[PDB]
Short mmCIF file of C-alpha atoms and ligand atoms in Angstrom, two decimals:
data_model
loop_
_atom_site.label_atom_id
_atom_site.label_comp_id
_atom_site.label_asym_id
_atom_site.label_seq_id
_atom_site.Cartn_x
_atom_site.Cartn_y
_atom_site.Cartn_z
CA UNK A 1 0.00 0.00 0.00
CA UNK A 2 1.98 3.03 -1.25
CA UNK A 3 -0.74 5.49 -0.06
CA UNK A 4 0.09 4.86 3.69
CA UNK A 5 3.46 4.73 5.62
CA UNK A 6 3.86 3.92 9.38
CA UNK A 7 5.83 6.65 11.20
CA UNK A 8 5.46 5.05 14.71
CA UNK A 9 4.28 1.64 16.10
CA UNK A 10 3.64 1.84 19.90
CA UNK A 11 4.84 -0.89 22.26
CA UNK A 12 2.96 -2.81 24.96
CA UNK A 13 -0.31 -3.10 22.98
CA UNK A 14 -0.55 0.75 22.86
CA UNK A 15 0.34 3.74 25.12
CA UNK A 16 -2.00 5.35 27.69
CA UNK A 17 -2.16 9.16 28.11
CA UNK A 18 0.00 9.16 31.32
CA UNK A 19 3.03 7.69 29.37
CA UNK A 20 3.26 10.47 26.68
CA UNK A 21 5.10 13.86 26.77
CA UNK A 22 4.53 16.67 24.24
CA UNK A 23 6.84 19.61 23.35
CA UNK A 24 4.72 22.37 21.67
CA UNK A 25 7.33 24.83 20.18
CA UNK A 26 7.50 27.38 17.31
CA UNK A 27 10.74 25.47 16.29
CA UNK A 28 8.26 22.72 15.15
CA UNK A 29 6.25 25.06 12.83
CA UNK A 30 6.22 25.04 9.01
CA UNK A 31 9.02 27.15 7.44
CA UNK A 32 7.90 30.19 5.39
CA UNK A 33 7.72 29.37 1.62
CA UNK A 34 10.87 30.30 -0.38
CA UNK A 35 9.07 33.00 -2.47
CA UNK A 36 6.94 34.11 0.53
CA UNK A 37 3.67 32.99 2.20
CA UNK A 38 1.76 35.45 -0.12
CA UNK A 39 1.08 32.38 -2.39
CA UNK A 40 -1.00 30.82 0.51
CA UNK A 41 -2.86 34.14 1.05
CA UNK A 42 -3.72 34.30 -2.72
CA UNK A 43 -5.23 30.72 -2.74
CA UNK A 44 -7.25 31.60 0.46
CA UNK A 45 -8.59 34.87 -1.05
CA UNK A 46 -9.69 33.03 -4.26
CA UNK A 47 -11.48 30.40 -2.11
CA UNK A 48 -13.30 32.96 0.16
CA UNK A 49 -14.44 34.90 -2.98
CA UNK A 50 -16.29 31.68 -4.10
CA UNK A 51 -17.30 30.33 -0.64
CA UNK A 52 -17.50 33.35 1.75
CA UNK A 53 -19.03 31.20 4.61
CA UNK A 54 -15.67 29.28 4.98
CA UNK A 55 -13.63 30.05 8.15
CA UNK A 56 -9.99 29.41 9.19
CA UNK A 57 -9.15 27.38 12.32
CA UNK A 58 -5.90 26.52 14.13
CA UNK A 59 -4.53 22.94 14.03
CA UNK A 60 -1.62 21.01 15.64
CA UNK A 61 1.36 20.29 13.32
CA UNK A 62 3.37 17.01 13.68
CA UNK A 63 7.16 17.62 13.48
CA UNK A 64 8.38 14.20 14.80
CA UNK A 65 7.83 11.55 17.51
CA UNK A 66 10.63 9.74 19.45
CA UNK A 67 9.94 6.42 21.34
CA UNK A 68 11.93 5.52 24.50
CA UNK A 69 14.11 2.35 24.54
CA UNK A 70 11.62 -0.62 24.80
CA UNK A 71 10.96 -2.03 28.30
CA UNK A 72 12.10 1.21 30.04
CA UNK A 73 10.38 2.91 33.02
CA UNK A 74 9.14 6.50 32.86
CA UNK A 75 7.72 8.44 29.87
CA UNK A 76 7.64 6.28 26.70
CA UNK A 77 6.99 8.81 23.85
CA UNK A 78 7.93 12.46 23.05
CA UNK A 79 5.61 14.21 20.50
CA UNK A 80 7.24 17.30 18.93
CA UNK A 81 4.31 19.55 17.87
CA UNK A 82 3.96 23.00 16.27
CA UNK A 83 0.90 25.03 15.18
CA UNK A 84 -0.66 25.35 11.69
CA UNK A 85 -4.12 26.15 10.22
CA UNK A 86 -6.80 25.04 7.76
CA UNK A 87 -5.71 28.00 5.46
CA UNK A 88 -2.06 26.82 5.46
CA UNK A 89 -3.23 23.23 4.72
CA UNK A 90 -5.25 24.45 1.63
CA UNK A 91 -2.17 26.39 0.39
CA UNK A 92 0.42 23.55 0.88
CA UNK A 93 -0.64 19.84 1.29
CA UNK A 94 -3.87 20.40 -0.79
CA UNK A 95 -2.02 22.47 -3.55
CA UNK A 96 -1.43 20.90 -7.00
CA UNK A 97 2.27 21.91 -6.45
CA UNK A 98 2.61 20.01 -3.09
CA UNK A 99 5.24 17.61 -4.69
CA UNK A 100 7.35 20.69 -5.73
CA UNK A 101 7.22 21.95 -2.07
CA UNK A 102 8.45 18.49 -0.86
CA UNK A 103 11.41 18.58 -3.37
CA UNK A 104 12.26 22.20 -2.26
CA UNK A 105 12.16 21.13 1.44
CA UNK A 106 14.61 18.24 0.69
CA UNK A 107 16.96 20.77 -1.09
CA UNK A 108 16.82 23.61 1.47
CA UNK A 109 16.31 21.78 4.86
CA UNK A 110 16.94 18.02 4.23
CA UNK A 111 13.23 17.71 5.25
CA UNK A 112 10.52 16.78 2.63
CA UNK A 113 7.86 18.22 5.06
CA UNK A 114 9.62 21.61 5.88
CA UNK A 115 7.24 23.72 3.65
CA UNK A 116 4.04 21.65 4.42
CA UNK A 117 1.29 22.53 6.95
CA UNK A 118 0.99 18.80 7.98
CA UNK A 119 -2.04 19.19 10.33
CA UNK A 120 -2.25 16.29 12.86
CA UNK A 121 -5.34 14.05 12.53
CA UNK A 122 -6.83 11.56 15.05
CA UNK A 123 -8.63 8.27 14.17
CA UNK A 124 -9.96 5.25 16.12
CA UNK A 125 -10.18 1.50 15.74
CA UNK A 126 -13.47 1.50 17.71
CA UNK A 127 -14.38 -2.06 18.96
CA UNK A 128 -17.86 -3.20 20.20
CA UNK A 129 -18.61 -5.42 23.25
CA UNK A 130 -19.44 -8.29 20.76
CA UNK A 131 -16.02 -8.01 18.96
CA UNK A 132 -16.66 -5.92 15.77
CA UNK A 133 -14.82 -2.79 14.48
CA UNK A 134 -16.96 0.26 13.40
CA UNK A 135 -16.77 1.67 9.80
CA UNK A 136 -18.40 4.84 8.29
CA UNK A 137 -19.25 5.60 4.61
CA UNK A 138 -18.27 9.10 3.33
CA UNK A 139 -20.65 11.22 1.17
CA UNK A 140 -19.86 11.01 -2.64
CA UNK A 141 -20.34 14.88 -2.62
CA UNK A 142 -17.32 15.91 -0.38
CA UNK A 143 -13.94 17.19 -1.74
CA UNK A 144 -11.60 14.65 0.05
CA UNK A 145 -11.93 10.87 -0.48
CA UNK A 146 -15.58 11.05 -1.77
CA UNK A 147 -17.63 7.85 -1.33
CA UNK A 148 -14.82 5.95 0.47
CA UNK A 149 -14.96 3.96 3.76
CA UNK A 150 -13.54 5.72 6.88
CA UNK A 151 -13.25 5.23 10.67
CA UNK A 152 -14.28 7.81 13.32
CA UNK A 153 -11.91 10.80 13.71
CA UNK A 154 -10.98 14.33 12.69
CA UNK A 155 -8.34 17.13 12.96
CA UNK A 156 -8.33 18.65 16.50
CA UNK A 157 -8.36 22.47 16.98
CA UNK A 158 -6.12 23.70 19.90
CA UNK A 159 -7.79 25.25 23.13
CA UNK A 160 5.66 19.19 29.97
CA UNK A 161 3.85 22.13 31.71
CA UNK A 162 1.96 23.04 28.53
CA UNK A 163 2.75 19.46 27.13
CA UNK A 164 0.38 17.50 29.45
CA UNK A 165 -2.63 19.72 28.56
CA UNK A 166 -1.87 19.16 24.83
CA UNK A 167 -1.69 15.30 25.28
CA UNK A 168 -5.02 15.54 27.25
CA UNK A 169 -6.65 17.53 24.37
CA UNK A 170 -5.50 14.87 21.79
CA UNK A 171 -6.97 11.92 23.82
CA UNK A 172 -10.17 13.98 24.63
CA UNK A 173 -10.61 14.90 20.91
CA UNK A 174 -10.79 11.22 19.68
CA UNK A 175 -13.59 10.51 22.29
CA UNK A 176 -15.41 13.77 21.35
CA UNK A 177 -15.26 12.77 17.58
CA UNK A 178 -16.78 9.32 18.45
CA UNK A 179 -19.61 10.99 20.56
CA UNK A 180 -20.33 13.67 17.85
CA UNK A 181 -20.36 11.36 14.73
CA UNK A 182 -21.48 7.90 16.11
CA UNK A 183 -23.87 9.50 18.76
CA UNK A 184 -22.51 7.19 21.57
CA UNK A 185 -22.71 8.22 25.24
CA UNK A 186 -19.24 9.19 26.65
CA UNK A 187 -19.77 6.72 29.55
CA UNK A 188 -19.86 3.74 27.10
CA UNK A 189 -16.20 4.48 25.99
CA UNK A 190 -12.82 3.27 27.45
CA UNK A 191 -9.83 5.62 27.90
CA UNK A 192 -8.06 5.50 24.48
CA UNK A 193 -4.68 3.79 23.82
CA UNK A 194 -2.34 5.29 21.18
CA UNK A 195 -1.48 2.51 18.63
CA UNK A 196 0.88 4.62 16.47
CA UNK A 197 1.13 7.33 13.77
CA UNK A 198 0.40 6.86 10.02
CA UNK A 199 1.22 9.15 7.02
CA UNK A 200 -1.22 9.72 4.10
CA UNK A 201 1.08 9.79 1.03
CA UNK A 202 -1.98 10.92 -1.11
CA UNK A 203 -2.07 14.21 0.93
CA UNK A 204 1.72 15.08 0.67
CA UNK A 205 2.66 13.06 3.81
CA UNK A 206 0.37 14.55 6.48
CA UNK A 207 0.13 12.31 9.60
CA UNK A 208 -2.66 11.01 11.92
CA UNK A 209 -2.41 9.56 15.45
CA UNK A 210 -4.38 6.23 15.44
CA UNK A 211 -6.07 5.06 18.74
CA UNK A 212 -7.84 1.89 20.07
CA UNK A 213 -11.15 2.63 21.90
CA UNK A 214 -13.42 -0.09 23.41
CA UNK A 215 -17.26 0.45 23.61
CA UNK A 216 -19.44 -1.38 26.22
CA UNK A 217 -22.38 -1.52 23.68
CA UNK A 218 -22.93 -4.32 21.12
CA UNK A 219 -22.84 -3.70 17.34
CA UNK A 220 -26.73 -3.62 17.27
CA UNK A 221 -26.83 -1.00 20.10
CA UNK A 222 -24.10 1.16 18.37
CA UNK A 223 -26.18 0.97 15.10
CA UNK A 224 -29.33 2.14 17.01
CA UNK A 225 -27.53 5.16 18.60
CA UNK A 226 -25.99 6.25 15.22
CA UNK A 227 -29.34 6.02 13.29
CA UNK A 228 -31.49 7.56 16.12
CA UNK A 229 -29.68 10.93 15.57
CA UNK A 230 -31.19 11.15 12.05
CA UNK A 231 -29.39 12.38 8.89
CA UNK A 232 -28.44 15.82 10.42
CA UNK A 233 -26.66 14.11 13.39
CA UNK A 234 -23.68 12.76 11.28
CA UNK A 235 -21.47 13.79 8.29
CA UNK A 236 -21.17 10.12 7.12
CA UNK A 237 -24.00 8.44 5.03
CA UNK A 238 -23.94 4.98 6.70
CA UNK A 239 -22.38 2.75 9.42
CA UNK A 240 -21.35 -0.94 9.22
CA UNK A 241 -19.37 -3.54 11.24
CA UNK A 242 -16.60 -6.17 10.52
CA UNK A 243 -15.81 -9.00 13.01
CA UNK A 244 -12.30 -8.49 14.59
CA UNK A 245 -11.71 -12.10 13.37
CA UNK A 246 -12.05 -10.83 9.73
CA UNK A 247 -10.08 -7.53 10.17
CA UNK A 248 -6.88 -9.72 10.16
CA UNK A 249 -7.26 -10.38 6.36
CA UNK A 250 -9.00 -7.04 5.37
CA UNK A 251 -6.07 -6.05 3.04
CA UNK A 252 -6.90 -9.16 0.86
CA UNK A 253 -10.63 -8.14 0.50
CA UNK A 254 -12.43 -5.91 -2.11
CA UNK A 255 -13.20 -3.53 0.86
CA UNK A 256 -9.47 -2.52 1.01
CA UNK A 257 -9.70 -0.69 -2.42
CA UNK A 258 -12.55 1.45 -0.91
CA UNK A 259 -10.73 2.42 2.39
CA UNK A 260 -9.37 5.97 2.65
CA UNK A 261 -5.63 6.14 3.57
CA UNK A 262 -6.36 7.45 7.13
CA UNK A 263 -8.58 4.39 7.84
CA UNK A 264 -6.02 1.97 6.25
CA UNK A 265 -3.44 3.28 8.81
CA UNK A 266 -5.86 2.64 11.73
CA UNK A 267 -6.48 -1.00 10.59
CA UNK A 268 -2.75 -1.80 9.89
CA UNK A 269 -1.82 -0.47 13.38
CA UNK A 270 -4.78 -2.36 15.03
CA UNK A 271 -3.65 -5.64 13.37
CA UNK A 272 0.07 -5.09 14.39
CA UNK A 273 -0.38 -3.66 17.95
CA UNK A 274 -3.67 -5.19 19.35
CA UNK A 275 -3.80 -8.32 17.11
CA UNK A 276 -0.63 -10.39 16.43
CA UNK A 277 -0.38 -12.30 19.75
CA UNK A 278 3.07 -12.89 21.37
CA UNK A 279 2.37 -15.72 23.95
CA UNK A 280 1.80 -19.53 23.94
CA UNK A 281 -2.03 -19.49 24.53
CA UNK A 282 -3.19 -16.95 21.82
CA UNK A 283 -0.37 -18.08 19.42
CA UNK A 284 -1.60 -21.74 19.49
CA UNK A 285 -2.85 -22.77 15.97
CA UNK A 286 -6.57 -23.24 16.91
CA UNK A 287 -6.62 -19.55 18.15
CA UNK A 288 -4.18 -18.15 15.43
CA UNK A 289 -5.04 -20.05 12.25
CA UNK A 290 -2.13 -20.54 9.76
CA UNK A 291 -2.29 -18.39 6.53
C1 LIG B 1 -11.34 12.11 7.82
N1 LIG B 1 -11.47 10.90 8.54
C2 LIG B 1 -11.12 11.04 10.00
C3 LIG B 1 -9.80 10.23 10.35
C4 LIG B 1 -9.81 8.88 10.44
C5 LIG B 1 -8.61 8.22 10.75
N2 LIG B 1 -7.52 8.90 10.95
C6 LIG B 1 -7.51 10.18 10.87
C7 LIG B 1 -8.65 10.91 10.56
#
């Protein structure tokens, strides 16, 4: 799958909030464009003159993420974050010239991402009490990945002594996106575990943090909550469920060709970090079938 690359695989079946540090610094921001950021302002002005109800919003930027030595005590991950915006995303990652900006960043900074907004997304492998994962169908009328299959998530808007509040907002945001789109009560959700970070090579290498969240409701009860909101309650056009048993071989199915890159990253990291058992019991052939 050339449209998705793994930047980080978390250890221990996934990291809880209390094991992650963030450094939010202007050293982690996008670099100004070689010929000036006026090119971003021009694209934004053209867009507002066609769609004047659009609004800008701040976003977190991923610079890098460093994992501790495996099996160590103390904090296990450092997230290096900067700030960006929807406007800067439309002028860089979304631009027809995004590949030229990546080549220029290699030349000038030894960093293909130096001139890219690279807003940080969040997504979830959301599991039911009866052992299914939750999938969403996108509208065929949206600009990005029209008509494809997705998982719950989004791109959090901002607001270790500013660090811990940022980690808290990332974990909070994946639960809020599940409650807003799937219409689940907050008290049916587990604290999330970070599985890893995936890059969308179809959007000039922007990254998403991918989480595991467990729901106490069955697949039928999740379906009821989603539908009982009515069409105005969700951006997606449908919900459906795949047994965790069958998620193992999803990349060999016709569904895989319909999955957006973001959602492919969530399922690869689920299979690697929560699936793939390590011990004698779950690794026995009757529980882990060959092939
Ligand atoms: C746009 N779809 C939301 C999303 C899903 C998975 N990862 C990141 C974002």
